Write a protein that binds this DNA or RNA. Structure first.
Lengths: 163, 163
DNA sequence: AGAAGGACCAGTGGTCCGTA
DNA sequence: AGAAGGACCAGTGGTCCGTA
């Protein structure tokens, strides 16, 4: 079992039997590389080429010895990686704030939604288009909860701001 | 059970308990319309919006009383519809030739591959890009056999034409 | 034989909940 | 209690093969 994550500030190495948030974001980068490898082979074999991280990519990671990668964990933190990709400055500031407050990873994770919803609001509430416009982020399915919040907020927007 | 298809020429109404090929192509158009309707609702509900005909679309067709639509049949003839979309003139000519020869639908269907492979060859063998570049055709997954033939042919091309 | 489609199957997206 | 991930489940892509 991998060591649990804790909230770290940018560049910080986590002390003890813990992993930091930069390590977390690095896992997404490693997954992206595994997708590139799956795509290379699919195209060479004339097979349908995936454009997203899929079960196939996770199996490929495991086969390549990257056991510490697993689907539930990667899907769980995807919106956190999203914020890091889309507004690294805000991501860094949120990390510093939550570290200072001694918040745990679950709480920091929850706080990551709000700024993403705000980014969505600034793009006609099109969260899919937000993900797809960022090269690193475009390979990740939009998480259910994030999509629901963006929709809840757009409705409140059309409602409150129609009176 | 729907009446079986027979090879017809453009505009021809099939006589007796038979359906013609224009009727067949019309079924694809109807499916496209059902996808548009599924997309409208997905987007309004803030759900992930499909970009392809999926099980969801077929279920939607059935619910709307279009029982004569079913997945196996639509998937079976998709490359035939593809040829009609991509090179209607060649499609028409192949239909006329096979009608004249008294060929059955299975044989005409088989003959539809070749011209599609040729179209693929003219686009760097990228059959996915061929499908995606045509607005009507882009919503249909490339059929397995067509993909395999395009790959078999590209290899023969790089092989024969490297000596 | 030629052909339409119910129904199954392997593998997917999605995440719960038994575990440490 | 906070957190990592095995494993399951509903529904998908894909098409075989029992049917007419």
């Amino acid at each position: 079992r991998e060591h649990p994550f804790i909230v770290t500030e940018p560049g910080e190495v986590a002390r003890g039997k813990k992993n930091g948030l930069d390590y977390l974001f690095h896992l997404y980068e490693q997954c992206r590389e595994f997708l590139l490898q799956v795509q290379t082979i699919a195209k060479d074999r004339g097979e349908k080429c995936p454009t997203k991280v899929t079960n196939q990519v996770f199996r490929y990671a495991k086969k390549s010895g990257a056991s510490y990668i697993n689907k539930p964990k990667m899907r769980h933190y995807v919106h956190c990686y999203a914020l890091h990709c889309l507004d690294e400055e805000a991501s860094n500031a949120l990390r510093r704030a939550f570290k200072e407050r001694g918040e745990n990873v679950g709480s920091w994770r929850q706080a990551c939604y709000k700024p993403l919803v705000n980014i969505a609001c600034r793009h006609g509430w099109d969260i899919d288009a937000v993900f797809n416009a960022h090269p690193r982020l475009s390979i990740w399915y939009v998480p259910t909860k994030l999509r629901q919040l963006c929709h809840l907020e757009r409705n409140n927007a059309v409602a409150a701001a129609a009176a």
